[PDB]
Design a protein around this ligand. Structure first.
Ligand SMILES: COCC(=O)n1ccc2c(Cl)cccc21
Ligand SMILES: *[C@@H]1O[C@H](CO)[C@@H](O)[C@H](O)[C@H]1NC(C)=O
Length: 350
């Protein structure tokens, strides 16, 4: 099945990096008032040289010129209940990542700019155009995303909520689901841009924007702090469910860890998991399995992992119920406490 159909944005000034129109893939579910808007990930680029290399061999992440006219919705974007026990009947939207800016940019290609970085405006424009295609009738808009798209959720969920309020749709409840986008600004295991520096450069290169309360806390020159979940999350007003492997492969990569493990690395990995667990202690809606993985929630077998006997589709369903005191047999805070990758037997097998 190739069930989500491409729509290029009607406002063609809201563009991918190369000035081609951004867009979204949509499958409507008539009669459902739930809307899932999913932000794709795919790292980022932060200067002319690394963006030029990405343009040569990762061009779909910078341009819509070669996008297919359809995509198949998978995992949380699947419309089959067997693959998606959570939201199989929802209106499904997949927003391709073609701005290379962690969904933070508001800058057009121009005179002075080889590339456009418009991630934050792409989300705004997708929402605006969907209002005319049924989103105006929504009861819940869940802004979800994986990896850089998961960080994108944290950066954008409250702006979507504010946009809908200002446009006159106060009854749509905006919520976020940030998958694999909750990173630590920690020390590398071995020195090698530890993300903090690349994001600091990105913000200037992209004209990148962060949520307003977080911006007001950290102030000018320090907005990179808001790309780190544990710092931006407490400032958010919308409900946000956080999914994060305790030993996320991309976190390990930026930490310069590449997997017989000796004492120093064992301690480093154990400490990483404990720090991740610590940052989620006061996140009431979370799913954080003790796995080394790069797998994301749009994979078809996303249903298989469990924490304390509860799957992510079940936890997300419990979260929905909690947003109608904790619920009998329906938990929402699911963080592993065991200290080493795959100490949870249900971790993705690879
Ligand atoms: C697999 O993707 C990795 C990825 O996208 N990233 C890894 C570190 C990071 C930060 Cl610190 C902010 C935004 C995106 C990031
Ligand atoms: C098109 O998008 C740009 C960027 O957000 C915005 O400035 C402009 O007002 C939009 N135009 C229309 C007609 O929506």
């Amino acid at each position: 099945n190739e069930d989500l159909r491409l729509h290029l944005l009607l406002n063609t000034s809201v563009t991918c990096n190369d000035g081609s129109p951004a867009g979204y893939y949509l499958k409507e579910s008539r009669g459902s008032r739930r809307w899932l808007l999913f932000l794709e990930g795919g790292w980022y680029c932060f200067n002319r040289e690394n963006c030029d290399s990405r343009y040569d061999t990762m061009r779909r992440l910078m341009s819509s010129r070669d996008w297919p006219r359809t995509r198949t919705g998978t995992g949380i974007l699947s419309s089959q209940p067997e693959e998606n026990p959570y939201w199989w009947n929802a209106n499904m939207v997949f927003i391709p990542y073609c701005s290379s800016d962690v969904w933070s940019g508001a800058s057009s290609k121009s005179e002075k700019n080889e590339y456009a970085f418009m991630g934050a405006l792409i989300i705004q424009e997708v929402v605006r155009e969907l209002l005319g295609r049924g989103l105006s009738g929504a009861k819940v808009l869940l802004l979800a995303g994986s990896s850089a798209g998961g960080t994108g959720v944290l950066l954008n969920v409250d702006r979507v909520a504010e946009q809908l309020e200002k446009l006159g749709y106060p009854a749509i409840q905006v919520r976020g689901l940030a998958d694999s986008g909750w990173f630590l600004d920690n020390k590398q295991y071995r020195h090698t841009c530890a993300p903090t520096e690349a994001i600091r450069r990105g913000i200037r290169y992209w004209n990148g924007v962060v949520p307003e309360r977080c911006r007001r806390q950290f102030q000018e020159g320090e907005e990179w702090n808001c790309f780190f979940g544990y710092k931006v999350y407490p400032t958010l007003r919308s409900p946000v469910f956080v999914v994060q492997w305790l030993f996320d492969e991309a976190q390990l990569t930026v930490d310069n860890v590449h997997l017989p493990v000796q004492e120093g690395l064992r301690l480093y990995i154990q400490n990483l998991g404990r720090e991740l667990r610590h940052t989620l202690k006061d996140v009431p809606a979370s799913f954080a399995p003790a796995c080394l993985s790069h797998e994301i929630i749009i994979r078809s077998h996303w249903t298989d992992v469990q924490v304390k006997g509860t799957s992510l589709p079940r936890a997300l369903h419990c979260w929905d119920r909690s947003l109608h005191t904790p619920l009998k047999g329906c938990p929402v805070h699911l963080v592993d406490s065991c200290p080493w990758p795959h100490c949870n037997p249900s971790c993705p097998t690879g």
